[PDB]
Design a protein around this ligand. Structure first.
Ligand code: F09
Length: 157
């Protein structure tokens, strides 16, 4: 079964646990390229009453560095916010809890904005079919495939 965080049947406790960044996408590609601040490798999500504790690592010159963030529920169901290189809000438009999680994020920094979409997997990679469903979701948000970067061959330290 699948759900959206904004849906009535969403069960947030079920996204708790291990995750891996499989693909990242953005309508401002530089943000997720090699030295971009948003090329974040998710490791785990800890679900709390009114927040999600997100654990990631970033890479630079082949060197990993850990980073944690706390995302707070906003006033709209299924939406969370977190301060990181500007102000961010995000939702989970689609997840099946056991294999994949697709997130949509809006960043606002210095009066600007951009969209980021992420495909996370319970294992370090996902099937080609789920990767295609992610490309379709990116298309629905006006993000071209050439702005979608598969990081499954670079998500481990
Ligand atoms: C559901 C938790 C993941 C939300 C998306 C975070 C994106 C970070 C920038 O890559």
């Amino acid at each position: 079964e699948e759900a959206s965080s904004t849906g009535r049947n969403f069960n947030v406790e079920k996204i708790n646990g291990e995750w891996h960044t499989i693909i990242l996408a953005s309508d401002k590609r530089e943000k997720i390229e090699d030295n971009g601040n948003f090329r974040l490798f998710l490791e785990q999500i800890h679900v709390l009453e009114k927040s999600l504790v997100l654990k990631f690592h970033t890479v630079r010159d082949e060197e990993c560095s850990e980073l944690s963030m706390v995302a707070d529920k906003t006033e709209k169901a299924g939406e969370y916010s977190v301060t990181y290189d500007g102000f961010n809000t995000f939702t989970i438009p689609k997840t099946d809890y056991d294999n994949f999680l697709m997130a949509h994020l809006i960043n606002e920094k210095d009066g600007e904005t951009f969209q980021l979409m992420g495909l996370y997997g319970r294992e370090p990679d996902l099937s080609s079919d789920i990767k295609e469903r992610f490309a379709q979701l990116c298309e629905e948000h006006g993000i071209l495939r050439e702005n979608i970067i598969d990081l499954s061959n670079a998500n481990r330290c």
